[PDB]
Paper text:
The PCI domain is a conserved bipartite domain comprising the helical bundle (HB) and winged-helix (WH) subdomains initially identified as the principal scaffold for the multisubunit 26S proteasome lid, signalosome (CSN) and eIF3 complexes. Yeast eIF3 contains two PCI domains, one at the N-terminus of its eIF3a/TIF32 subunit and the other at the C-terminus of eIF3c/NIP1. PCI domains are known to be protein interaction sites. a/TIF32, the largest subunit of yeast eIF3, has been implicated in building the core of eIF3 by interacting with c/NIP1 and b/PRT1, two other large eIF3 subunits. Taken together, we propose that one of the key roles of the a/TIF32-PCI domain is, besides building the eIF3 core, to contact mRNAs in a non-specific manner and promote their delivery to and/or stable binding on the small ribosomal subunit.
The crystal structure of a/TIF32276-494 was solved by single wavelength anomalous dispersion using a selenomethionine (SeMet) derivative and refined to the final resolution of 2.65 Å. The asymmetric unit (AU) is composed of two molecules of a/TIF32276−494, which corresponds to a solvent content of 45%. Although the first molecule in the AU (chain A in the pdb file) is almost complete, the second molecule is only partially defined in the electron density map. The crystal structure of a/TIF32276–494 consists of two intimately connected subdomains; an N-terminal right-handed helical bundle capped by a C-terminal winged helix (WH) domain. The helical bundle (HB) is composed of three pairs of antiparallel helices with structural resemblance to tetratricopeptide repeats (TPR). Interestingly, residues 337–362, which form the loop and the helix connecting helices 3 and 4, are not present in the structure of any of the known PCI domains. The winged helix sub-domain shows the canonical α-β-α-α-β-β topology with an N-terminal elongated helix, which is kinked at the beginning. Most notably, R431 of helix 7, E392 of helix 5 and R363 of helix 4 are tightly linked by hydrogen bonds locking these three helices in place. R363 and the adjacent K364 together with R431 contribute to a positively charged surface on the concave face of the protein, proposing a function for this region in mRNA recruitment (see below). The results indicated the formation of a complex with the stoichiometric ratio of nearly 1 (0.944), the dissociation constant (Kd) of 158 nM and a relatively large enthalpy change of −10.23 kcal/mol.
Numbering used by the authors: 278 to 341, 345 to 493
Write the structure that this text describes.
């Protein structure tokens, strides 16, 4: 079966940390499932919502040889996939996007098209309560929380020079199950630092953070 081989591929790519190949293999499985006539409409909604959520919660494109080449080949990509393009390919594919739960579309709008650090918590607040009722949701909690805080941090890198950790972390503390403690928030920030999305200065005795250039 080509289905099981793709299924297996989505698992592999999920544990590898190559999320773009994960949602890609998902799409390759979905086309198959759509050809198939054992189609329940609910599997469609679950799979489509799963796929789209995978794309939303995908890490922002680091700009980096390429060791994904045989995987690109295996999956019939001809170039390195892009987060923005994956999301776009899903949005413009009505076979998928017509089955996507509207909570994920609301979510997409909030973090991709109308992001504001000064409004995110209030907007995400009850939405995440709804999303926490979804069965496809829990396993993307970690990468989704990671991408929004990343959004929060670069937006912060441009708003602040020197700011208290209290105001910074309170600002980066997302609602509902995307909540992280202060030490995790400081680590997530140090992570964004080493990925060169940000240049900082951290555990100053003054309990402050200093965003650089």
């Amino acid at each position: 079966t080509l289905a099981n081989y793709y299924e297996n591929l989505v698992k592999v790519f999920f544990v590898s940390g190559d999320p773009l190949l994960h949602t890609t293999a998902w799409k390759k499985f979905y086309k198959l499932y759509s050809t198939n006539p054992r189609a329940t409409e609910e599997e469609f909604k679950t799979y489509s919502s799963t796929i789209f959520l995978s794309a939303i919660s995908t890490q922002l494109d680091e700009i980096p040889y390429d060791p994904h080449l045989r995987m690109y080949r295996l999956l019939n990509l001809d170039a390195k996939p892009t987060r923005k393009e994956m999301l776009q390919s899903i949005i413009e594919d009505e076979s998928i996007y017509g089955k996507v739960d509207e909570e994920l579309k609301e979510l997409y709008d909030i973090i991709e098209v109308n992001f504001d650090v000064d409004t995110v918590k209030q907007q995400l607040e009850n939405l995440l309560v709804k999303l926490s009722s979804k069965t496809y949701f829990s396993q993307y909690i970690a990468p989704l929380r990671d991408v929004i805080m990343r959004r929060v941090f670069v937006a912060a890198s441009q708003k602040f020079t020197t700011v208290s950790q209290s105001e910074l972390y309170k600002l980066a503390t997302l609602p509902a199950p995307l909540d992280l403690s202060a030490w995790d928030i400081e680590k997530s920030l140090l992570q964004a630092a080493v990925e060169d999305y940000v240049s900082i200065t951290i555990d100053h005795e003054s309990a402050k953070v200093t965003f650089a250039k």
